[PDB]
């Protein structure tokens, strides 16, 4: 069909921009985690000793240092997601204020989606897959900090059972950015016309790439409720840390995103 | 077979008509709708409330914001039994582990109540007492410090949910998809729940394609609204624990309602 064909070209375009925007793809993450010979095995951090050994190999309190580590990686992800968003057709043509709103609300939902790529049951890849930090070591951190990652692992284990690949995820993250139910949006209709087109492209991609996977489209859109709950839970955890650690700085970029969310 | 999807759509519509007295078609006729054969009594004010209690026979009723809250709770307890009856008509539901049926109802009913509340709302108010009354959004915002923003978030949800222009035949399937959620906590056997929710999502997809052929990606937009339902529900429960810190200290009344 002429219309299918425009949907495949949109899918190829977004996958292309996704590869160019995100240095560590799920395909590379899965090669490192499942020990494929295409990639180097990571140094594993499971305790204080392996952590300090990590400083040497992969290149102030421990819970805090790991937390600032996450923080900076989040800032980097925000920069890669903002560069991907510019590639989404129509996005840069929107009201500048709506561009800002779509990024502010969308970026955390995208971070937890793509963070699932780097996770299994037992832990998470770090320093572009040169390291692996165990889930158990993260859960054993000091009182406020030991709970930060657990909800991300729980989402990730469920999300990964969908067995999406990068070409699926490129279209899904574009659908997330182009919501239009986000608060404070000036012109909802230009946003929903783009989301509509992205949702058509996602639906055909999943039919073609997962022809045996019944209602994968609906099952993936339902996962949007889990992303919203991880974001809401994470923000109220940051409100606790702000108050118990008055000496701990937050990046302004993260601060501007969380501002009246 | 697309015919077997048309079967459970029909079946769910028939059962939804039997379970829920005030359908969206009826609510709409009375609201923004004209159908001027019997206009609702409007509650806009303290004296409208007091007169309303007089005109409409209210089944609840032995401060003003407390008595409205109690009336809403009474309606919720009735809606739970209507939804429970509807659930038992969904193919496969009664064959699930009984603990899993109870779990699915326990977590589902709140999401269904707000879904169905939207049928009875416009941007200016909510229908009550089976469509015989109408409580204004302004009057509900006007109420005391905690009770003034219990209904507001549901109005904002309803305005947005109602823009989809679903009818009863669409909503009947949507409500079933909500109930058969495999992600409720403490479920013992997720497989048969996800397998029924699969079949229901197929039926809802086909229903929205046939019932709304010019409404692009309605299915996606409706599934996205489930994200908003969960937020409303989590936001509502936290507001409820503050209300359990004003209307403190009947014992048998306490029991009938409960958080459970
Ligand atoms: O740089 C990373 O990729 C990184 N990632 N994660 C998980 C994660 C979180 C958020 C996002 Cl968006 C991504 Cl993609 C990945 C960390 O938890 C993490 C922790 C760090 O702390 C230390 C500190 C001293 C030694 C060793 C590690 C350092 C770096 C990281
Ligand atoms: O009985 C009703 O229909 C009713 N409904 N709602 C909204 C609602 C809630 C849940 C569900 Cl599922 C639905 Cl579908 C609709 C109320 O808020 C409400 C408030 C009341 O308060 C008073 C008290 C004294 C006088 C006048 C009104 C009385 C009755 C009601």
Swiss-Prot record, chain A:
Post-translational modification: Phosphorylated in basal conditions and dephosphorylated when treated with the ligand. May be dephosphorylated by PPP5C. Ubiquitinated by E3 ubiquitin-protein ligase complex containing FBXO9; leading to proteasomal degradation. Ubiquitinated at Lys-20 by TRIM55 leading to proteasomal degradation. Ubiquitinated by E3 ubiquitin-protein ligase STUB1/CHIP; leading to proteasomal degradation.
Region of interest (Interaction with FAM120B), ranges: 1-48
Gene Ontology terms describing biological process: BMP signaling pathway; cell differentiation; cell fate commitment; cell maturation; cellular response to hypoxia; cellular response to insulin stimulus; cellular response to low-density lipoprotein particle stimulus; epithelial cell differentiation
Record localization: Nucleus; Cytoplasm
Induction summary: (Microbial infection) Expression increases when incubated with M.tuberculosis or its lipoprotein LpqH; induction is TLR2-dependent (at protein level).
Chief location bin: nucleus
Keywords: Activator, Biological rhythms, Cytoplasm, Diabetes mellitus, Disease variant, DNA-binding, Glycoprotein, Isopeptide bond, Metal-binding, Nucleus, Obesity, Phosphoprotein, Receptor, Transcription, Transcription regulation, Ubl conjugation, Zinc, Zinc-finger
One GO molecular-function entry: double-stranded DNA binding
Activity-regulation annotation: PDPK1 activates its transcriptional activity independently of its kinase activity.
Locus of motif 9aaTAD: 252-260
Annotated rosiglitazone binding sites: 71-74, 108, 234, 258
Ranges for domain NR LBD: 6-260
Disease field: Defects in PPARG can lead to type 2 insulin-resistant diabetes and hyptertension. PPARG mutations may be associated with colon cancer.
Domain notes: The 9aaTAD motif is a transactivation domain present in a large number of yeast and animal transcription factors.
Family: Belongs to the nuclear hormone receptor family. NR1 subfamily.
Assembly behavior: Interacts with FOXO1 (acetylated form). Heterodimer with other nuclear receptors, such as RXRA. The heterodimer with the retinoic acid receptor RXRA is called adipocyte-specific transcription factor ARF6. Interacts with NCOA6 coactivator, leading to a strong increase in transcription of target genes. Interacts with coactivator PPARBP, leading to a mild increase in transcription of target genes. Interacts with NOCA7 in a ligand-inducible manner. Interacts with NCOA1 and NCOA2 LXXLL motifs. Interacts with ASXL1, ASXL2, DNTTIP2, FAM120B, MAP2K1/MEK1, NR0B2, PDPK1, PRDM16, PRMT2 and TGFB1I1.
Protein name: Peroxisome proliferator-activated receptor gamma
Organism (species): Homo sapiens (Human)
């Amino acid at each position: 069909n002429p219309e299918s064909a425009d949907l495949r070209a949109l899918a190829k375009h977004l996958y292309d921009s996704y590869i160019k925007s995100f240095p560590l793809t799920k395909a590379k993450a899965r090669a490192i985690l499942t020990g494929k010979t295409t990639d180097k095995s990571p140094f594993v951090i499971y305790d204080m000793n392996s952590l300090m050994m990590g400083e040497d190999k992969i290149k102030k309190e421990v819970a805090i240092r790991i937390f600032q580590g996450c923080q900076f990686r989040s800032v980097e992800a925000v920069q890669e997601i903002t560069e991907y968003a510019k590639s989404i057709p129509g996005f840069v043509n929107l009201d500048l204020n709506d561009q800002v709103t779509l990024l502010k609300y969308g970026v955390h939902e995208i971070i937890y989606t793509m963070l699932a790529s780097l996770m299994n049951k037992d832990g998470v890849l770090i320093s572009e897959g040169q390291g692996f930090m165990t889930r158990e070591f993260l859960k054993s951190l000091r009182k406020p900090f030991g709970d930060f990652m657990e909800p991300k692992f729980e989402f990730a284990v469920k999300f990964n059972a969908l067995e999406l690949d990068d070409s699926d995820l490129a279209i899904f993250i574009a659908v997330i950015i182009l919501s239009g139910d986000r608060p404070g949006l000036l012109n909802v209709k230009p946003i929903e016309d783009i989301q509509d087109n992205l949702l058509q492209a996602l639906e055909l991609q999943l039919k073609l790439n997962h022809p045996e996977s019944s209602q994968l489209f609906a099952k993936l859109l339902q996962k949007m409720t889990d992303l919203r709950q991880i974001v809401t839970e994470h923000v109220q955890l940051l409100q606790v840390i702000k108050k118990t650690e008055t000496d701990m700085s937050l990046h302004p970029l993260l601060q501007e995103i969380y501002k009246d969310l």
